Ligand binder design. Structure first.
Ligand SMILES: O=C(NO)c1ccc(Cl)c(NC(=O)c2ccccc2)c1
Ligand SMILES: [K+]
Ligand SMILES: [K+]
Ligand SMILES: [Zn+2]
Length: 399
């Protein structure tokens, strides 16, 4: 069974932010318009017995002080009075400002994603679902005491922490345009959570990590976590095929060597050629979309898997992508063919898919070899540090 997190309240909260507007409603209504919902098990967001149990869950990663400030930020934005100088300074100390502003539902909005992704992890742990999807989750930039990149609470870290505390190894795969720095940092010292981000990196591009660290070198973990954080920064302009060839052997080698108990995939849609960032040239095409190639490969491992959203600022094209990811997950997990019309069906948000109303996005389509050698050596070093049994040449042959 394939689970997916939704709910009426969940939907309201996921649609209450100024940056992401109603993207979540488009995604779930397009999934519904394509008649995928009856194939999927609804996973309800987690709710708690008391404020103390809620704090205990969230502060498994975040500091109490940051959680307190985030809740105060919501309360301050629910009254009319301007913030005081002291409250502005408090908020600045947690980077609750600039690109992570307050708004009337900021705490409930942020928490909802945590509630969704923790319930998703639970459904995998008890074996109710083989795969769970949460298109309201994936907020990989939030840090223990710092908002970042419109990420206020890191639902991924909390879900992964629940998975590993259930020996258990989690492989985290971050397909977002941006480096998954918050998840990487949370598990920097943990060999049991191997993180892998593929992303654009270049001078001045957010958040600035996931690349050569200023012959400069790649940091990759520390302590017993040495060699356990993997990164693949890519030049702008990369298409589906090159991105797929870049990531494919890495994914397979990580699975062979790490043998994860769970995979967690962030599927940020900002690599689409039609995303406003206009950096990568990925598509949602399915004859091949780099996203669908990656997800199909990961699912072919038959490891219990969490699929999360993330970036994606062209809301209809993010819906078009994540609808195909959802249909692909059903087909791969259940072995049951999913036929998706190339035309958007009529539904609530039909007009948002103008002017053509097609499921395809509207787009006419040595460095990587050096990163592969680097990553293969790091993986050898990770296996050597952690005394993992594996065939070197089977792994080497993948590349
Ligand atoms: O997706 C993000 N993190 O995974 C993310 C993190 C930091 C920033 Cl600054 C942004 N920026 C945008 O969303 C954006 C940029 C150009 C046009 C329209 C929107 C996104
Ligand atoms: K990424
Ligand atoms: K790690
Ligand atoms: Zn992003």
């Amino acid at each position: 069974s394939v689970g997916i997190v939704y709910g009426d309240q969940y939907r309201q909260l996921c649609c209450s932010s100024p940056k992401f507007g109603d993207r979540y409603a488009l995604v779930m209504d397009l999934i519904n318009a394509y008649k995928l919902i009856p194939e999927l098990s609804r996973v309800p967001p987690l709710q708690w017995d008391s404020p103390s149990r809620m704090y205990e869950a969230v502060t498994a990663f975040h500091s109490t002080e940051y959680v307190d400030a985030l809740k105060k930020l919501q309360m301050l934005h629910c009254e009319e009075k301007e913030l005081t100088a002291d409250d502005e300074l408090l908020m600045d100390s947690f980077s609750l400002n600039y690109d992570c502003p307050g708004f009337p539902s900021v705490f409930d909005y942020s928490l909802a994603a945590v509630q969704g992704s923790l319930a998703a992890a639970s459904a995998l742990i008890c074996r109710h679902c083989e795969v769970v999807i949460n298109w309201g989750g994936g907020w990989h930039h939030a840090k223990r005491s710092e908002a970042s990149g419109f990420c206020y609470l890191n639902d991924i870290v909390l879900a992964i922490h629940r998975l590993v505390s259930s020996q258990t190894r989690v492989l985290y795969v971050d397909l977002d345009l941006h480096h998954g720095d918050g998840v990487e940092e949370a598990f920097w010292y943990s060999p049991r959570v191997v993180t892998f981000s593929v992303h654009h990196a270049s001078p001045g591009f957010f958040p600035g990590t996931g690349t050569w660290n200023m012959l400069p070198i790649f940091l990759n973990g520390a302590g017993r976590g040495r060699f356990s954080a993997f990164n693949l920064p890519l030049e702008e302009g990369i298409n589906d095929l090159d991105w797929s060839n870049a990531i494919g052997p890495i994914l397979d080698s990580l699975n062979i060597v790490i043998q994860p108990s769970y995979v967690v995939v962030q599927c940020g849609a900002d690599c689409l050629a039609t995303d406003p960032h206009r950096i990568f040239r990925l598509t949602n095409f399915y004859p091949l979309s780099g996203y669908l190639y990656a997800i199909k490969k990961i699912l072919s491992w038959k490891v219990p898997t969490l699929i999360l959203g993330g970036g994606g600022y062209n809301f209809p094209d993010t819906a078009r992508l994540w609808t195909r990811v959802t249909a692909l997950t059903i087909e791969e997990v259940k072995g049951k063919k999913m036929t998706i019309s190339p035309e958007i069906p009529e539904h609530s948000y039909f007009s948002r898919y103008g002017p053509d109303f097609e499921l395809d996005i509207d787009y006419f389509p040595d460095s990587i070899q050096k990163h592969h050698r680097r990553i293969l050596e790091q993986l050898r070093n990770y296996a050597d540090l952690n005394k993992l049994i594996y065939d070197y040449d089977q792994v080497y042959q993948l590349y």
